[PDB]
Every structure is written in C-alpha cells, then in structure tokens.
Chain A
Amino acid sequence: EFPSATAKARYVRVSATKARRVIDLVRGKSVEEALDILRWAPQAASEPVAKVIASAAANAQNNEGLDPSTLVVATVYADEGPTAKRIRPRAQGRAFRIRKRTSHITVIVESRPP
C-alpha cells in the first residue's frame, strides 16, 4: 500500500488492442524510461499514452506532493469504450459495417522507494 496517483483518458480514438500492443512494454517500467520508450516507439498509439503518463506524474507532483523519480507505472489498462457504426458499401449491392472504435486508458503510478 504505497502512495499512488491516478490518471485517465476517455473517448480516445485508438483501438484498445493497438493500445495494449504498446502498454505491454511499460507495465512496470519507471515513468521517465517509459516516456522515452514511447517517444522513440514506432507506433501511432504512443502519443496518447505519453500524455496520460505524464499527466499522472504531474498530478502526483502537484496535487499530492511526490518526488518524480520515486515513481513507477504500477498498473495500466486500456479498455473498450463506445463504438460508432458506418455502413460502408461494397459490391453486388451489398453493404458491410465498419465499426469505428475508441478506448479508455487508465494509469495508476505508485511512489516506490528502493
């Protein structure tokens, strides 16, 4: 039960699977290191996650007065939000259903001394 801070992000325009593909890297990585990994990641879902993680770290600093280097990305999870439907058309008079997905993203950073 170490002191934590929370951060969320909702109605984001990246499918949750393509979020998890990145988040697997940084479950347990320190904040600074994860931010850098995500700066230099070749994925188009790294920037939202970057913003969320720095958000949580900032909230920990300001609102709960915590050292930024005692921190880790303890718990992370991305989940499926709403879904919008688009009747995209296709041959022989047929019409198929695109589903434009979204995702919520959740981060909880502890403050761990060694």
Chain B
Amino acid sequence: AVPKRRMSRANTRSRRAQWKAEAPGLVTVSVAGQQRKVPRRLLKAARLGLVDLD
C-alpha cells in the first residue's frame, strides 16, 4: 500500500530514535606487560595470542 499523509516531525524523530546502538561491555587485558580494553567474549583468545590488537 501507500501512505496517505506526511508523517510529522514528532513521530518521525521519535521512532527514528529507536534505531540506535549499544556499546560492548569492555574489560581490561594484561597484554604482555601493558593493558588494553577488549570485550569479555574474546578475553581468552586475547590471552592466548589470536586477537589482532591495533
């Protein structure tokens, strides 16, 4: 089908504000004497030397 009206500013921006993003929950790692912040999902793989840390 097809809309019928020019859906307003309020409604538009309101719903548009649901299309957002969340940030992964970060955690320290003692990468060879120094520290970097990495998700928890990848913690073991970092401590074992696979994660490409730039």
Q: Do A and B touch each other in the complex, judged by CB within 8 A?
A: yes
A22 B21 Cβ-Cβ under 8 A: yes
Contact between A24 and B21, CB atoms less than 8 A apart:
yes
Residues of A within 8 Å of B26, CB to CB, are 36-37, 40
Interface size bracket, A side: 10 to 19
Q: What is the predominant secondary structure among interface residues of chain B facing chain A? A: loop
A100 within 8 Å of B (CB atoms): no
CB contact between A25 and one of B23, B36, B54 (< 8 Å): that residue: B23
CB proximity of A28 to chain B, nearest CB, Å: 13
Q: In the complex, which residues of chain A have a beta carbon less than 8 angstroms from the beta carbon of B5? A: none
CA distance in complex: A17, B47 (Å): 36
* Distance between Cα atoms of A39 and B26 in the complex (Å): 11
Asked whether, in the complex, the Cβ of A36 is within 8 Å of the Cβ of B37, the reply is: yes
Quick one: CB contact mask for B3-39 with A, threshold 8 Å, 1 for yes?
0000000000000000111011010000000001111
Query: In the assembled complex, which residues on chain A have CB atoms less than 8 Å from the CB atom of B37?
Result: 33, 36
Query: Which residues does B use to contact A, with CB under 8 Å?
Result: 19-21, 23-24, 26, 36-39, 54
A-B interface, 9 closest residue pairs, ranked by CB to CB distance from nearest: A36-B37, A37-B23, A25-B23, A21-B21, A40-B24, A40-B39, A36-B26, A22-B21, A25-B21
Query: Which residues of A are interface residues toward B (Cβ below 8 A)?
Result: 21-22, 24-25, 33, 36-37, 39-41, 43
Complex A-B: 23 CB contacts under 8 Å: A21-B19, A21-B20, A21-B21, A22-B21, A24-B21, A25-B21, A25-B23, A33-B37, A36-B26, A36-B36, A36-B37, A37-B23, A37-B24, A37-B26, A39-B54, A40-B24, A40-B26, A40-B38, A40-B39, A41-B21, A41-B23, A41-B24, A43-B21
